[PDB]
Amino acid sequence: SKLRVVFATDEEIAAHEARLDLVQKKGGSCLWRATRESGSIGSMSEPRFVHLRVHSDYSMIDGPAKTAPLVKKAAALGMPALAITDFTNLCGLVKFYGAGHGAGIKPIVGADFNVQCDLLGDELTHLTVLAANNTGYQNLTLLISKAYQRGYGAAGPIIDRDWLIELNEGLILLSGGRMGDVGRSLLRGNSALVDECVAFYEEHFPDRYFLELIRTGRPDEESYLHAAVELAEARGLPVVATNDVRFIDSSDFDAHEIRVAIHDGFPRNYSPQQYMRSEEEMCELFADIPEALANTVEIAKRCNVT
Ligand SMILES: [Cl-]
């Protein structure tokens, strides 16, 4: 296969084992190391998929950051790790960390951003930032502070892409898919701009930038996916599957659409597929691109914030 999986190094694997020890010592269980009843230690299997892009209900709007229901759902699905990636905030982190531990889940720390870059002018693009280690966590905190400190208008807090140069250490980036700088430029056929953007990530985020692939039945998602996979194969860039999770169950879609409208003051930016899909569901969805699934599990092992 010419699609790259970025494997956690021996050092990262050791940090992952230590991070699971912490889950287990604080919580009294660890789903990653759990043995099903009538199963055996010898027949235990690794996770096939981990959610790395997940928002609480009020993430980009006004309201509380309740992360309890996301942990509750992940625990019910037997998920051994979960990221919360709320919009330019870490509100729910302290509670997510504790609840994660209580449920035997490895908590992964991240946030979603709107990004501005000179190459794209004034246009805002999507980026997900994961903290791989405590230095990354500190840098993620600093990046959020920087976005607020320079102030914002109705468009909300924004980061400059170039701020990532100085703040890069311990961060793993998910590209934003069709909404990211690379994705938008792929959809527009701007090969020269794709090349400039990819050069930035290769320089500052070596093995720490993933082309995000998303299948939620929204416009341009699959056309972008085709182009991203072609780019990934030609450049050796790793792809990663996410489900851009915005609510817990598919039946929650109705309430989500309405919460967004109230805040907006009224545009169909969201799909009913953006729920917390099971590992089995995600594996079937990306059966044709198993590398996109494998990279979620490797990224999950690489993310160890204590
Ligand atoms: Cl098992």
Q: Walk me through the domains of the chain, giving residue ranges and CATH numbers.
A: 1-306 (3.20.20.140)
Structure token pair of residue 42: 């010898």
Structure token pair of residue 45: 């299997």
CA of 259 to the centre of ligand 1 (A): 39
CA of 93 to the centre of ligand 1 (A): 29
How many Å apart are CA 173 and CA 1, to the nearest integer? 23
CA of 33 to the centre of ligand 1 (A): 8
CA of 63 to the centre of ligand 1 (A): 39
Task: Please identify every residue whose CB atom is under 5 Å from ligand 1, which is an ion.
Answer: 35-36, 39, 44
Strand 171-174 relative to strand 81-87, pairing: unpaired
CA of 30 to the centre of ligand 1 (A): 12
How many Å apart are CA 170 and CA 208, to the nearest integer? 9
CA of 42 to the centre of ligand 1 (A): 9
CA of 277 to the centre of ligand 1 (A): 20
How many Å apart are CA 286 and CA 282, to the nearest integer? 6
CA of 246 to the centre of ligand 1 (A): 29
In the chain, the N- to C-terminal Cα span, in Å, equals: 35
CA of 74 to the centre of ligand 1 (A): 17
List the one residue out of 116, 268, 125 whose CA is nearest residue 187. 125
* Sign of the torsion formed by the C-alpha atoms of 24, 30, 33 and 34: positive
Distance of CA 143 to the CA centre of its chain: 17
Strand 209-214 relative to strand 239-242, pairing: parallel
In the 3-class helix/strand/coil scheme, how is the chain assigned residue by residue?
CCCCCCCCCHHHHHHHHHHHHHHHHHHCCCHHHCCCCCCCHHHCCCCCCCCCCECCCCCCCCCCCCCHHHHHHHHHCCCCEEEEEEECCCCCHHHHHHHHHHCCCEEEEEEEEEEECHHHCCCCEEEEEEECCHHHHHHHHHHHHHHHHCCCCCCCCCEECCHHHHHCCCEEEECCHHHCHHHHHHHHCCHHHHHHHHHHHHHHCCCCEEEEEECCCCCCHHHHHHHHHHHHHHHCCCEEEECCECCCCHHHHHHHHHHHHHHHCCCCCCCCCCCCCCHHHHHHHCCCCHHHHHHHHHHHHHCCCC
How many Å apart are CA 86 and CA 53, to the nearest integer? 9
CA of 39 to the centre of ligand 1 (A): 5
CA of 80 to the centre of ligand 1 (A): 12
CA of 46 to the centre of ligand 1 (A): 9
CA of 48 to the centre of ligand 1 (A): 13
